[PDB]
Amino acid sequence: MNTVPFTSAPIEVTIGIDQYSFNVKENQPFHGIKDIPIGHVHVIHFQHADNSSMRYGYWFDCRMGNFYIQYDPKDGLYKMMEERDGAKFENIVHNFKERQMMVSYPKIDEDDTWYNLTEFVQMDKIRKIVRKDENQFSYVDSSMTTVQENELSDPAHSLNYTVINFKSREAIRPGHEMEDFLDKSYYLNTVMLQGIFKNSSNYFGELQFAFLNAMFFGNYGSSLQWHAMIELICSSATVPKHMLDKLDEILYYQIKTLPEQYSDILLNERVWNICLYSSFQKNSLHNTEKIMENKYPELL
């Protein structure tokens, strides 16, 4: 079990760790988060009390280093940093635990939610979508635009998701115009899976990361990417059976975790109705269709 200590909490802020969150008051004696499960990526995120504009946060993996948070009064935000001196870090943490100034990652033992939302998400892949090679952790916020959004403006602060465009020469083989547009299997299986992602695990990892950035930061380009990656699978007539079964599980847990009150903005009516009721895979997503119908029947 790993720990992310905080130097201090000088401004009132709502702090998230994965799907959990808690409020810290201005100058409250808060010194971090303990008992964080090893084996998963994690995200620690922030919304200031005085300006809910800009949710921001950091993706990290405690196996890759010792990380802590410190407020910067000049740039006005909570920054993640790496401590290289390992005995300095252990001594800081042990002292903060002895004084019980830390919240405990509050995982229920029965509960596999976070695993199920991050099953295929890897830090190494995150660091290629979010490019800042001098850090082992990755900053994301509400406002960051994607490479594709920038094509349709600061490239260093962009989310470099894989570009998917159904009316593109990459998507459409010369001479198979109708075939490839109406059945996207060659774009899914040859162009994207064999060519770009190499395997379905990496495809699912980017899909899951895009969903999480949409949900935790309200990042609009991430929501676009999540729906595009769902739509590319649902609009393919030929999909490996193992990917369909896994996709159904992935989406089930995403829809289950989505705040009931954010559905209006994080779910695209067209994509979901097409995917569940019109597409080739309209009958292959039983778990996802059942939770959607019981939880969001208005959208449909």
Binding site: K167, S168, R169, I172, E177, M178, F181
Partner: protein, 237 residues
């Protein structure tokens, strides 16, 4: 964006553009089978691709053999239309290729966009005007060449005959649309008006009769009456 009643005058500027109408590509007769079920029989069709500035018509005849053994023909028809329009553009010299293609039905947008990916600078546009190009098969010489085709064929016409020698493309298009709007509403009466007077003939190299300027005014007016007449017969006004 969409061409409408606000910006329809762009039709008569000097940027090359084509209208594409697909309403006569897939044509069928519906009939009963010996068992009393219903079946369709396709007949030859055509793509109606028109330069509104010059009158040049690229009539691509769609022979019934293109449908043999194919499913979902109404959907295929849109993709075949887009395939043939893309082939036409590629066949034209660069300086004759259009800058814009306006489709008369919005269901042609995605098929044509996908077939024209190699031409990113050619704009594919819809239109909000409910135009009458479906009535092109009421022009006897166009219907005749479509029905007689025994294989795929492209036939070139000028749908304005020699009118541009005397009137502007705006006025010529106005004359063509009025004629087509009337053949579509009452074909029998429309053709009666056009041929009633045996002394006015259609030249071998033309589609419409050789009316003087003053006779076109009379013809135009008789077409304005027919449309209105039928409008009253229909709605009881």
């Amino acid at each position: 964006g969409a061409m409408n009643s606000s910006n329809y005058a762009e039709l008569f500027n000097n940027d090359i553009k084509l209208f594409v109408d697909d309403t006569n590509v897939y044509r069928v007769t519906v009939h009963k089978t010996f068992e009393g079920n219903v079946a369709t029989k396709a007949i030859n069709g055509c793509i109606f691709t028109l330069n509104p500035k010059t009158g040049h018509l690229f009539l691509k005849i769609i022979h019934t053999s293109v449908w043999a053994g194919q499913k979902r023909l109404s959907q295929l028809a849109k993709w075949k239309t887009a395939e043939e329009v893309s082939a036409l553009v590629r066949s034209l010299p660069k300086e004759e290729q259009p800058k814009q293609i306006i489709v008369t039905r919005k269901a042609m947008l995605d098929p044509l966009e996908v077939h024209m990916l190699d031409f990113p600078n050619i704009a594919i546009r819809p239109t909000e005007l409910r135009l009458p190009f479906s009535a092109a098969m009421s022009i006897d010489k166009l219907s005749d060449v479509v029905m007689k085709a025994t294989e795929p064929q492209m036939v070139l016409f000028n749908i304005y005959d020699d009118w541009l020698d005397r009137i502007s493309s705006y006025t010529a298009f106005s004359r063509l649309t009025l004629l087509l709007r009337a053949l579509k509403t009452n074909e029998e009466s429309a053709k009666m008006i056009l041929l009633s007077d045996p002394t006015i003939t259609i030249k071998s190299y033309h589609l419409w009769p050789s009316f003087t300027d003053e006779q076109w005014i009379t013809i135009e007016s008789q077409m304005r009456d027919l449309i209105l007449t039928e409008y009253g017969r229909k709605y009881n006004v």
